[PDB]
Design a protein around this nucleic acid. Structure first.
Lengths: 10, 10
DNA sequence: GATCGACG
DNA sequence: CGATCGACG
């Protein structure tokens, strides 16, 4: 996720 | 699929 | 991070 | 055609 907590996705 | 019956996938 | 989202 | 298809941070 994110960042943070990428995306998703990427 | 295949082709035939792409891949999967692509 | 959370049973992750977006190319024949 | 196919089949709850399968493989970039």
């Amino acid at each position: 996720t994110x960042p943070g907590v990428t995306x998703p996705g990427v």
